[PDB]
C-alpha cells in the first residue's frame, strides 16, 4: 500500500537560511495538488545532511500536520550515527508517518554486519513502521552488491528499497529475488526504464515540479502506450539536463518560486546561488510547467 | 538499414585451439535459422583480441561466404593500432560486409582528437561501408562522455553506435541529440530497458543461443505488450545470471555444443575451461532452449 | 610552526557510548608523555562525524584545558554544513586553539567555488587562526586535482594541508608548488616515503599508540640514516596491518585500553566491537609498545 | 642478478611507421653510454601493443645483437593471448635475454587461476629464463591484490615484480612478504619514495633520456644523503610533468631526436604527433640534458 510515486520533498528556507515554515506547507500542499501518492521527507533532496536533528524533526512534524491523512508519508531518518537515526525514527512514529527510511551510513567504511545492526536498531525505534532501505551509491560511496542488498532487504521490518542506481540489470535481479518487495526507482532520468526493469514506483526530486508526468508514465506503461511513456520521459529529461546544469535542488526551488510556492529559493551553504544567467530558462520552465 | 538485432558471433575453436571452420559455418547458419537480423563479427565476443589479423580476416571471409545476401553483416575491424584496423577494414570491404565497427582503442590512453583520427582512417579504408562506433567502457577502460560521443558519432561516415553501457540516461540523451543515429543496446540484461530509453536495436553475445527472445521483446514493445517484454527479459536475465557465473563466452559455447552446433566449446588461453560443476545447468539450458 | 608530527586524537567513550572525560584527558597526557608535537582533534579519527556539534565543542575545551601551551593544538571543525563548521570554528578560537581544519564538505557534490566559499566562511569565523585544508578522498569521495588543491591552499588564511592521499607524485608536486605550505602526511603506512616526497610532517591515528616511532623516522631521515627509517616504517606497518584487520579505531582504543589509558575501547554505532579472536594479538601489541 | 635500474626501451619508427633499425641501435648504445643497468624491451613504452609478434621478435633480436653481455636484457613477452606470449618468450631465450616479462592479460577479465596458468605457460616457454611479473593497473585495468601478488610472485620461475603502482603501502608489504624478490619501482615520479618503501630498483621510460639522475638517486640513498636524493627526484618530476603534458612516449622520442639519437620522433597511430606549441620546451630540455 506504500508502492507508488513519492516526491522527495525539498526544505524551503528563508533569506537567513532558516526554515521557511509558510513555504514548506505550501510546497506540501502543492505536491498533493499534483496528485502525488506521497512525500519522502528528510532525504538528500531535503538538505537533511546540512540540517540538525531538531530541524529535521521539525520538518517531519509540520509536514505530518499538513499531510497526515491526505497522502502517504515516509520519513528519511538516516544519519551516519545509529543513535541519531534511532532518535529521528521515534519522532517518525510519534508523528504518524507511514514509514521510516535510512541511507546506508556513509563516510566511514562499515561492514555488512554493521550496516544490518544499524538498520535493526533503527527499525526497533521505528516501533512498527516499515523500513525503506536507501541505496544511493553516488552520494554515499556505498556500492551494495546484489547479495548485500538481499541481506538488508530481508531484515525483519524492511518493506521497501529506494534504488537510486542506474543499473537496471540489478533493478530486475532485485525484483526477481524479492517479488514482494516495494521497489522505488531513485533516478528520475530513467524512471520509464526503471519501471520496465522491475520497479513498481519511484521517489524523485523533480516530482516537486512535475509529478504528474511521472504519474503519466505509470499510466501509459500500465495502459500499454509505450509511445507516450517515452514522450513523457523525454520531456522529463530535457528538464533534468537543465536542472543538472543550474544545480538540481536550487534549480527546483527557483522553479517553485516562480510558481508561487517557494518564497526564497535558497539552499544552505556550501550550496551556492543559482547563476543569474539561468533565471530566464528556469522562469520559462516554470511558465510551461504550469500546464 | 542497419537497425535491428545482431548476434555478436562467437569464434569456434578445435581441440588444438585453431579455428573450427565447420563449427563456424554451423554457428552462422544456426543464427540465421534463428531469425537474427544479422551478425556482428570479430568483436569482443568473437575473441578477436586473442586472434591474429590473419585469423580474424579468415573469419570474415568464411562468414561472408555463408551469410552474405542472407543477413546484415557488420565487421569489427578494431585493433589498438590504426594501421591494423585499416587492414581489416579493407578486408571487410573486399568481402562485401555491410559495415565496419571498431572499439575505442585501449590500454594506452588516447585523446578525443586521436580517437577521431583513428575512426577517420578506418572509415577511409572502409571505402564506403558505414562505421559503427563501439563504446564498451567495462572492457576498454575508455569511459566516453556525452560530448565525446557526440563528436565521434557526427564524424563523416559514422552511421551507428554500439552502446555497451548501462547508463540509460546517456542512452536517451544520445537518442535525443541524434534522432537518426542507429543505436544498438549492448547489455543483453537490459535490452528491454535499453529499447525503451532510445535504443533501436541491439548487439549481444547471448543472441547466439536465444536471439528469438530479443526479437520477441522487440515485437512486444512494438505491440505495446509491456507484460510480455518483461517476461522475456527476466527469462533472458536468468540465463545471463548463469552465463556470468560460468564465463559468458565459454558458457554460451558449451550450450551451443549441447545444441549440437559447436564441436568443441573451448575458448583460447588465458581463458580456462568451464567448471565441471556447471555442465548440468548448461545441459539443462541447452535442452530447455532447444524446445 | 604548525610543522611537525601531530596525533589525530581519538575520543574515548564509556559503556553507554558517552564521552569518557577521564579517559580523554588521560589519552591527551599519554600522547604528550610520548613527545608528540601537537594534536589534531575532532577529525575523522575522533569519530567526529558520529558526534554532535555540542560534543565536539566540549572535546575541544577538555583537550585545550589539558594541552593549551604544552603542545600545538589543531581543531578539526569540518562539517558538511558551513554554518555548523563556522560555529565549531569560533569555539576553536574561544578555547585558544592554534589552528582550524576542515574536511572538504562531502556527500553532496560541490563546485570548487562552493568549496572555496565554504573555507573562507570558516576562516572568517576562525577569527584569525590558520586553516588546515583536509583532503581525504577515500572517506569524503572528493578527488581533489593538483589545480583544485592549488586554489584551496592559496586561499587567504590557509597555512597547511593535511594530505591523506597515497599519491606521492602529487605530494611532491604540492611541495614544489607551495614551498611555504605545511604538508602533513596523511596515511601512516607511507610516512617515511611521504616525508621523502615532500611532506614536512604528518597527522596520524596510530600516533596515539606509537608516535615516538614516527618521531624517530623524522630523526633518522633528518640525520641521513635511511636504514633505520625503513626498519621503523616496517614496524609501524606490521602494526597497521593488524589494525586494518581489526578495525583501525576500535583496534587502537583497545590497545590503549591494554595500556591503561582508555576505560572502554568502544567506538560509537554503527561502528561495531572488536573481534574476540583478535584480542590476544592486540594485547601482545600493547605489551611490546610499552618499552 | 636482476637487481638494478633498467630503462624501458622505446621503439623508434620511420616516417612510414616502420621499425627504424639504425635508430633502435643508437638508442641502445645511448642507454648503455648512460650507465644503465639493463634494458626492458617490448614493454608498454616500447609500443608493443601496436606491433605484430613478428615486429616484436625483430626488436628483440636487434637489441640482443647490440647489448647481449654489455648490460642486462629483459624481454617483455606479454600479450593477451597465452599462445602468442609463449611464441615471443621462445624468441627471448633464442636471442640471449636474461629474463622474460609479461603484463597481466587485459581487456577480458581473467581469474587468478587463469592468470597463474598464463604465467606458468610463459615460464615454460621461456625455457629457463626467470619471469618478471608486470603489474600496471592503470593501463591494464587489472588491480592485483597483495594476495594475488603473492600467488603470482611465488610461482616457480618468477624472479621479480615490475610494480607500476603508486601504492607505496603495498610496495612495502610486498618487500616484507618477499625479501628475496626483485622489486622494480614502476613510476619514475616516485622513484625515490618507492625505493624507500622497499623497491629493489626500477624500470622506466624516462630513464631513456636521464637514466643517470635515477642512478644518482640510488647512490644518494645508499650513501644516506636524502638531501640530494630529493633534489634529483624533483628535477625528474619537472621533466615528467612536461612529458605528461606533451605525451610521454612522443615527448621522449622528440627529445631523443633533438639529441640526434633517433631520426623520426614518431609514435604509431592512434598516437598523434607532438603539439607544435610544445617543441620549444622539448628542445630546451634536450639542450640541458646534453648539458
Distances (CA, A) of A242 to A136, A247, A266, B109, B179: 22, 8, 18, 31, 20
* Active site residue ranges of A: 134, 162
The C-alpha atoms of residue B99 and residue B89 are separated, in whole angstroms, by: 9
Contacts of A47 (CB under 8 A, 6+ apart): A10, A11, A249, A267, A268, A271
Interface of B with A (CB under 8 A): 166-169, 172-173, 176, 187, 189-190, 192-194, 196-198, 221, 224-226, 229-230, 233-234, 237-238, 240-241
Chains C and B touch (3+ CB pairs under 8 A): no
Residue D155: count of CB within 10 angstroms of its CB:
16
Burial A132-169 (b: 16+ CB within 10 A, else e): bbbbbbebbbbebeeebbeebbeeeebbbbbbbbbbbb
3-state SS assignment for residue D162: strand
Q: Do residues C39 and C11 touch, judged by C-beta distance below 8 A?
A: no
In angstroms, the separation between the Cα of residue C8 and the nearest Cα of chain A is: 16
Q: Measured over all CA atoms, what is the biggest interatomic distance in chain B, rounded to whole angstroms?
A: 50
Contacts of A180 (CB under 8 A, 6+ apart): none
Which of A51, A111, A270 is facing C117, going by the closest CB pair? A270
C-alpha dist (Å) from residue C235 to A201, C214, C238, D119:
54, 10, 5, 33
**Which of C112, C125, C269, C274 is the mutation pick for testing A, counting most A CBs within 10 A?**
C269
Residue B252 and residue B239: Cα distance in Å, rounded?
Answer: 10
Half-sphere exposure of A268 (CA within 13 A, CB side): 27
Q: Which fold has domain B1-291?
A: TIM Barrel (3.20.20)
Residue of C168, C225, C238 with shortest CB distance to D168: C168
Question: Would you give the DSSP letter of residue D144?
Answer: -
Burial group, residue C25, by CB count within 10 angstroms (0-12, 13-18, 19+): middle
Residue C166: exposure state from Cβ atoms within 10 A (0-12, 13-18, ≥19) = buried
Q: Residue D261: how many CA atoms within 13 Å on its side-chain side? A: 26
Closest among C34, C89, C98 to C69, alpha carbons compared: C98
Interchain proximity D237–C169, CB inside 8 Å: yes
Chains C and A touch (3+ CB pairs under 8 A): yes
C91 touches C60 (CB < 8 A): yes
Q: Is D83 left (phi over 0), alpha (psi -120 to 50) or beta?
A: alpha
Is C165 labeled as ligand-binding? no
CA dist., res. B199 & res. B135, Å (int): 14
> CB–CB of D139 and B108 under 8 A?
yes
Spatial contact of D108 and B271, defined as CB atoms under 8 Å apart = yes
Query: Are the C-beta atoms of residues C45 and C205 closer than 8 Å to each other?
Result: yes
Within 8 A by CB and 6+ apart from B262, the residues are: B10, B12, B20, B23, B26, B27, B253, B256
Provide the β-strand partners of residue A99: A74
For the annotated catalytic residues of B, the residue numbers are: 134, 162
Neighbours of B94 (CB within 10 A): 13
For residue C198, give Cα distances in angstroms to B213, C5, C184, C290. Answer: 60, 14, 9, 31
Q: Residues with Cβ < 8 Å from C188, sequence gap 6 or more?
A: C202, C204, C205, C206, C207, C214, C236, C240
Residues on A contacting B at a C-beta cutoff of 8 Å: 166-169, 172-173, 176, 187, 189-190, 192-194, 196-198, 221, 224-226, 229-230, 233-234, 237-238, 240-241
User: How many whole angstroms separate alpha carbon C51 and alpha carbon C269?
Assistant: 10
Contact C269 A117 (CB under 8 A): yes
Q: What angle do CA C9, C11, C14 make, to 5 degrees?
A: 155
- To the query of whether residue C207 is one of the catalytic residues in this protein, the response is no
Q: Which candidate in D40, D72, D119, D162 is catalytic?
A: D162
Nearest CA in chain B to A229: B196
**Chains A and B touching, counted as 3 or more CB pairs less than 8 Å apart:** yes
User: What technique was this entry resolved by?
Assistant: X-ray
Distance CA A31, CA A7 (A): 7
Give the N- to C-terminal CA distance of chain D in Å, as an integer.
32
**Contact list, D176 vs chain C (CB under 8 Å):** 234, 237-238
Judged by DSSP in three states, B162 sits in strand
C-alpha closest to that of B193 among D259, A42, A170: A170
C-alpha cell at B281: 545447468
Query: Resolution of this PDB entry, in A?
Result: 2.3
Instruction: Kindly report the number of other CB atoms within 10 A of residue A1's CB atom.
Output: 7
Contact B189 A196 (CB under 8 A): no
Ligand-binding annotation for C69, yes or no, is no
CB atoms within 10 A of CB B252: 26
Contact B184, B161 (CB under 8 A): yes
Please tell me the distance from the alpha carbon of residue A250 to that of residue A254, in angstroms, as a whole number.
Answer: 6
> How far apart, in whole angstroms, are the C-alpha atoms of residue C252 and residue A34?
54
C50/A268 Cβ within 8 A: no
Q: Give the residue extent of every domain in chain C.
A: 1-291
Q: Which residues are CB-neighbours of C94 under 8 A, at least 6 positions away?
A: none
Amino acid at each position: 500500500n506504500l508502492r507508488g510515486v513519492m516526491a522527495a520533498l525539498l526544505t524551503p528556507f528563508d533569506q537567513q537560511q532558516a526554515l521557511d515554515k509558510a513555504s514548506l506547507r505550501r510546497l506540501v500542499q502543492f505536491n498533493i495538488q499534483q496528485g502525488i501518492d506521497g512525500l519522502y521527507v528528510g532525504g538528500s533532496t531535503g538538505e537533511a545532511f546540512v540540517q540538525s536533528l531538531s530541524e529535521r524533526a521539525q520538518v517531519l512534524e509540520i509536514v505530518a500536520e499538513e499531510a497526515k491523512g491526505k497522502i502517504k508519508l515516509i520519513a528519511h531518518v538516516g544519519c551516519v550515527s545509529t543513535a541519531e537515526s534511532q532518535q529521528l525514527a521515534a519522532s517518525a512514529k510519534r508523528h504518524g508517518f507511514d514509514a521510516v527510511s535510512a541511507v546506508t551510513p556513509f563516510y566511514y567504511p562499515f561492514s555488512l554486519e554493521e550496516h544490518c545492526d544499524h538498520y535493526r536498531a533503527i527499525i526497533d525505534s521505528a516501533d512498527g513502521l516499515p523500513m525503506v532501505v536507501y541505496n544511493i551509491p553516488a552520494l554515499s560511496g556505498v556500492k551494495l552488491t546484489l547479495g548485500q542488498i538481499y541481506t538488508l532487504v530481508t531484515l525483519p521490518g524492511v518493506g521497501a528499497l529506494k534504488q537510486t542506481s542506474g543499473d537496471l540489470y540489478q533493478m530486475e535481479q532485485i525484483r526477481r529475488e524479492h517479488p514482494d518487495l516495494v521497489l522505488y526507482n531513485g533516478y528520475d532520468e530513467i524512471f520509464a526504464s526503471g519501471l520496465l526493469a522491475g520497479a513498481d514506483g519511484g521517489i524523485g526530486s523533480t516530482y516537486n515540479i512535475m509529478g504528474w508526468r511521472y504519474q503519466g508514465i505509470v499510466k501509459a506503461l500500465k495502459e500499454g502506450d509505450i509511445q507516450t511513456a517515452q514522450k513523457l520521459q523525454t520531456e522529463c529529461n530535457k528538464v533534468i539536463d537543465l536542472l543538472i546544469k543550474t544545480g538540481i535542488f536550487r534549480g527546483l526551488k527557483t522553479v517553485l518560486h516562480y510558481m508561487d510556492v517557494i518564497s526564497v529559493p535558497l539552499c544552505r551553504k556550501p550550496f551556492g546561488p543559482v547563476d543569474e544567467k539561468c533565471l530566464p530558462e528556469l522562469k520559462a520552465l516554470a511558465q510551461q510547467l504550469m500546464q
